[PDB]
Amino acid sequence: CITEQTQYFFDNDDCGNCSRIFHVEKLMNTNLIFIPCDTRLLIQAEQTSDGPDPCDMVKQPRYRKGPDVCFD
Amino acid sequence: XXXXVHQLVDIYEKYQDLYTVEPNNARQLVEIAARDIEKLLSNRSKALVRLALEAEKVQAAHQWREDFASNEVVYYNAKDDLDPEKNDSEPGSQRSYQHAAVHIPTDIYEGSTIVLNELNWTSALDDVFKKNREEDPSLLWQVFGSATGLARYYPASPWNKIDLYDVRRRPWYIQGAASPKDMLILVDVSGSVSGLTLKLIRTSVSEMLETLSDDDFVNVASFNSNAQDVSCFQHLVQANVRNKKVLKDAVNNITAKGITDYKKGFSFAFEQLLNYNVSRANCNKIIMLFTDGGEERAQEIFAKYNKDKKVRVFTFSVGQHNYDRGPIQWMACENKGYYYEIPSIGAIRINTQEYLDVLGRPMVLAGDKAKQVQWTNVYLDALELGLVITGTLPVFNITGQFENKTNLKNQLILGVMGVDVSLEDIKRLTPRFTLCPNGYYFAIDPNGYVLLHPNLQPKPPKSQEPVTLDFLDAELENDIKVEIRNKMIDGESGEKTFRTLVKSQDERYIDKGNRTYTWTPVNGTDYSSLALVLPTYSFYYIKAKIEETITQARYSETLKPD
């Protein structure tokens, strides 16, 4: 704590870095590591989206005989 | 030799007295391994073709006469064995080589005109040629999946635990029927459903999204007296893990409250379905009402937004109630779409039963040249084995609504067997056409959402898979590296390669350095092979040959025996 205060000054002078792991004991544990220890898990959801998805294949959907079998 | 210091240098001097190998072509390693995988996938694809060409025939001539009772199959073969691919093959007939296992849904009963009738023609020829496919080792788990019962080749023994396991639900099979799917749910939260059918419907979405493909966009349009969405407003690609969890837990709180706008929900339903701005993933465009029973037609909006009929409607009346099925039954039939109910907790099998097959219609039609193998994302085997990709193909009827979906298990273990690990000593990584690789950057557990210790008090429903992962999250972000995965995810670029100086996570504290690394798209089906490399060089020392003095060092190993 106070040692983490001296560490806080050490940060002012190293590398606080959140690093999620989705693995571990089931839960999505976050991991700070500096260049203090594994804790629980949280957060994502996001607002801005990214990482382009793709497909560009098949996607058959056009038809010429959708039988009105319906149900029943 | 890192910290081994100058004393280690003499070993290099001894290596100067000895031999090496160097090599490490990097690029060619990638080309070769990718091509090799192409060769495996080709062998097993061609193998997959056989079940198409053959099961199409017997089914065409299965006669399907009832009567039965006499000789089918029957009894229960039991020949013990144990070997590679784990598991001691021995006894396997709920109804290597030696006969074949035939799984059934635990609720489905081996006592029907339909069941046994399948059971005849399926094994009756499948056994032979699949065994012919065993002539070419080593098919890890050839598997057939029909409308109900599994056909496992060779007698791995099925199976106080309850086997709730089905096949219609199990994802590889879901992939084998109609892809992809633009999905837009409309729960009817109208102050009308009780908390009862609300619980049911809650469970219903809760599972259906799991039933839903793990590469298809989805929302949840709650509506009554007003339309509204659970927060996101874009949808989704789905990490499956996180996204579906968000939406699901959001469903967990869904109190009924308010009068039925009906049309207004539809008004956004087509609209939220409409859009155009990014993502979306164009294809089939369908919405799903789960409701007590509509009070009106809404043909007005339909003609207002649909006539191309690319829209579909799956309406799911649930529970008991008493409201007429009419306006609903009118609707799905009105618009191409197949209405059907979930009275209680028949929810499992009913969900799958036509959620896919009704979408199978186009595939039944002009689809035929489309029967290219459709590979799946990584997931754990129902039997202990470890995670295993499974290539599927559809098989058609003769005049009807599609037969059944065969597949091959492929151990990612032997996928790694093609993945050499000796010229180097850091990491491979093989990102999928979207999320995930099979990269040796992680182990073997089902990801999981966030937290939650279950309330111990009520507890006196066991693993679901797939192990979906971001490439981005599997390993440290670099923007530039994000450029790279967003480059490869399109698959466009080939040999394009460069270092990114970067800090790298290890056990529990990070390093830093350059890593020039090769990668290529597979020439065949999507994917992309990759080879991250400690830009240390690109070589790998070895040694050869002869016994003699090397045999004497082998004698030093003999000294090493004790």
From Swiss-Prot, chain A:
Domain of life per record: Eukaryota
Protein name stated in the entry: Voltage-dependent calcium channel subunit delta-1
Organism encoding this protein: Oryctolagus cuniculus
Full-sequence portion shown in this chain: 977 to 1064 of 1106
From Swiss-Prot, chain B:
Subcellular localization: Membrane; Cell membrane
Stretches assigned to the Cache domain: 375-460
Motif window: MIDAS-like motif: 188-192
Tissue and organ distribution: Skeletal muscle.
GO MF term set: calcium channel regulator activity; metal ion binding; voltage-gated calcium channel activity
Binding site for a divalent metal cation: 188, 190, 192
Residues in VWFA domain copies: 182-359
UniProt keywords, alphabetically: Calcium, Calcium channel, Calcium transport, Cell membrane, Disulfide bond, Glycoprotein, Ion channel, Ion transport, Membrane, Metal-binding, Phosphoprotein, Signal, Transmembrane, Transmembrane helix, Transport, Voltage-gated channel
Entry's Gene Ontology cellular component terms: L-type voltage-gated calcium channel complex; T-tubule
Glycosylated residues, chain numbering: 43, 87, 120, 253, 277, 523
Miscellaneous comment in the UniProt entry for this protein: Binds gabapentin, an antiepileptic drug.
Domains: entry comment: The MIDAS-like motif in the VWFA domain binds divalent metal cations and is required to promote trafficking of the alpha-1 (CACNA1) subunit to the plasma membrane by an integrin-like switch.
Function: The alpha-2/delta subunit of voltage-dependent calcium channels regulates calcium current density and activation/inactivation kinetics of the calcium channel. Plays an important role in excitation-contraction coupling.
Protein name: Voltage-dependent calcium channel subunit alpha-2/delta-1
Organism of provenance: Oryctolagus cuniculus
Name of the coding gene: CACNA2D1
Residues of the full protein shown: 56 to 654 of 1106
